[PDB]
Amino acid sequence: QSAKIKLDAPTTRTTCTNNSFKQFDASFSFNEVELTKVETKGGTFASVSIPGAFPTGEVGSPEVPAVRKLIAVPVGATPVVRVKSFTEQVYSLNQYGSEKLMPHQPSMSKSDDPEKVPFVYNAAAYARKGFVGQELTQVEMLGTMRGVRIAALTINPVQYDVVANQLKVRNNIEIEVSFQGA
Amino acid sequence: GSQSAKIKLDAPTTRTTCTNNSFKQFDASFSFNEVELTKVETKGGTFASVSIPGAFPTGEVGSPEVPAVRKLIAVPVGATPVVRVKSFTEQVYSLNQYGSEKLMPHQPSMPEKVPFVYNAAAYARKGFVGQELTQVEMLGTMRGVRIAALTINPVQYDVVANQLKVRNNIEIEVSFQ
C-alpha cells in the first residue's frame, strides 16, 4: 500500500539539452511523491519517495528523497551549477496520517544480526519546528574511472517541517551546468 | 578550417530525456538537431571530422571516427542494467557534396608521443560500418555508487560511398535485473 501525492508537474521527467561543448541545461520535474507506512522498532513512520530517488538525512533525523545525476567532466574543467527557476508548494501530511517521516538509520555492518541493531531516533530533531533540508543543488567530483572524470549532481527537492508534518517541494527545476576552465 | 559545416538532422533540438516510471525501470530518449563537419589537417592528410553536441569520438584505432553519446547511471545493488530499443528514426547523408575527404581515423589517446594510425583496409570496406545502437558497461563502484556507462551509437559510416547513416529520436527502456 502507498499514498500518491500529486505535485505541480504533469510528469516525472529529467531533460538535458546540450546547448554548447562546455554547457548544458537540465530540467527536473516530479509528478508525485509516494508515501508508504513503515513498521519499525520505534513505531510506525511514513517514508516519502520520488521515482528514481534515494533517501537522505542525518542518522536519527527524518529521511527525505534526493535525486542524483552522474555527469562526465572534461579534462581541466570544474562543473558549476546555476539555478534558473523552480516552483515551490507545501503539502500537509497529517491528512494521510499523523506519523512523521521515518528516521534515517545507520549503514548496516555486514556481521551484525539485523534484529539486534539499535534503532536510532533523535527525539530533539523530531521536536524542532520549521522547514529543514539541504541546498537545492550540489556538485561533487567523485573521481576518475576508465579515463572518465565523474561528477555527481544532486538535486534535493524536499524540505520537511517535522512538527507541522509538512513537505515543501521544489519542482520544475531548471538549471544550467557550465564547465569552467582556464 | 575551424568553422564547421552544419548538417541538419531530423530532430528540432539536441536533447536527452529520462522518464522515471519505477525504481526498477526508466525510459530514455536521445535526439540530435545536427551533425557538425570540420576539415582537419593531420599527419596522414586532410580528413573530415563529424561531431554531435555532447558526443565524444569513437571507433577502432585507425578506423573512421564517429561520434557517440555516453550516459552515466547509478546501478542498484545486485542489479544488471538491460537496455531495450523501442524506436528510432534513420536517414542517410551523403558527404561527398561537402568534400571528397573521408572521416578522420581514430587515434589511440593524446605532442609527438602517439604516432599517426591509419588502417588502409578499414578505409576500403564497402557498406555501413558501426557499433550496435546501444551498449551497457559496468564501470565499477565510486563512493558507494555502482556506475554503468550507457553508450548510444547513432552513427554508421560507409567509407567507400562517404555516407553517414544517422539514427535519431532514439527511444529506449532501461530495466535493472
UniProtKB/Swiss-Prot annotation, chain B:
Proteolytically cleaved into a catalytic subunit and three adhesins. Arg-gingipain is involved in this post-translational processing. Residues 8-177 form a propeptide. Belongs to the peptidase C25 family. Cysteine proteinase with a strong preference for substrates with Lys in the P1 position. Hydrolyzes bovine hemoglobin, bovine serum albumin, casein, human placental type I collagen and human IgA and IgG. Disrupts the functions of polymorphonuclear leukocytes. May act as a virulence factor in the development of peridontal disease. Involved in the coaggregation of P.gingivalis with other oral bacteria. Has hemolytic activity; this is mediated by the adhesin domains and does not require the catalytic domain. The isolated adhesin domains have hemolytic activity (in vitro). This is Lys-gingipain W83. It comes from Porphyromonas gingivalis. The lineage of its organism: Bacteria, Pseudomonadati, Bacteroidota, Bacteroidia, Bacteroidales. The chain holds residues 20 to 199 of 1732 of the full protein.
